[PDB]
Amino acid sequence: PTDAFGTIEFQHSNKAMYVRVSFDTKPDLLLHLMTKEWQLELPKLLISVHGGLQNFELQPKLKQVFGKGLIKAAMTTGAWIFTGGVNTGVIRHVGDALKDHASKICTIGIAPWGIVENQEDLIGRDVVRPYQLTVLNSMHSHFILADNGTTGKYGAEVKLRRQLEKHISLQKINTRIGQGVPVVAL
């Protein structure tokens, strides 16, 4: 039985809300987790961002363009962008983008609990987590972290996200114009 749903309290400052799960979860299970106990609305688009797994760089105007684009796009459709989760790769640039606007919006962070810096203290429920095995992007309020047991590989998040993307595109909650929230992979 699972034991962590805390928050990050890094000393800027920003809270979060997450849960450790396993690869053996249903996507409709995580759906009512997202809509009820997480109390989250449905998006009108899913901005699934994948990237170079190692921490890369962009040209400065690419950085500003990607930042302003993701921020302004998220505002128009009022949506939640699936990402990886750790402060590495494209996900670091996504957190820098969220710092570039920093006004109001939330982005979901499907990643492994298997790879997490200081796994043990974040078992603490709703407890301060001042992130100083990689730390998760501090600018993320939502990051589902699948504890598949095994520690230090990149697993239980390629499949999990895969299902949750297909499921949230297919299940069609709310208004469901077209068929569910249309999903676009940036």
Partner 1 sequence: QDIDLAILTALLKGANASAPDQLSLALAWNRVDIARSQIFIYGQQWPVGSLEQAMLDALVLDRVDFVKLLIENGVSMHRFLTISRLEELYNTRHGPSNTLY
Residues that bind partner 1 in the complex, under the rule CB under 8 A: 10-13, 87, 117, 130, 132, 135
Cα separation of 157 and 155, whole Å?
A: 5
Tell me how far, at minimum, the Cβ of 132 lies from partner 1, in Å. Answer: 4
Cα separation of 95 and 110, whole Å?
A: 14
For partner 1, which is the closer residue by CB, 76 or 132? 132
Tell me how far, at minimum, the Cβ of 160 lies from partner 1, in Å. Answer: 25
For partner 1, which is the closer residue by CB, 137 or 148? 137
For partner 1, which is the closer residue by CB, 8 or 135? 135
Cα separation of 106 and 20, whole Å?
A: 19
Tell me how far, at minimum, the Cβ of 49 lies from partner 1, in Å. Answer: 20
For partner 1, which is the closer residue by CB, 47 or 136? 136
For the chain, the residue count is 186
For partner 1, which is the closer residue by CB, 13 or 39? 13
CB of 70 closer than 8 Å to CB of 81: yes
Q: At what angle do helices 90-101 and 60-77 cross, to 10 degrees?
A: 70
Cα separation of 174 and 123, whole Å?
A: 33
Closest among 49, 43, 55, 70 to 173, alpha carbons compared: 43
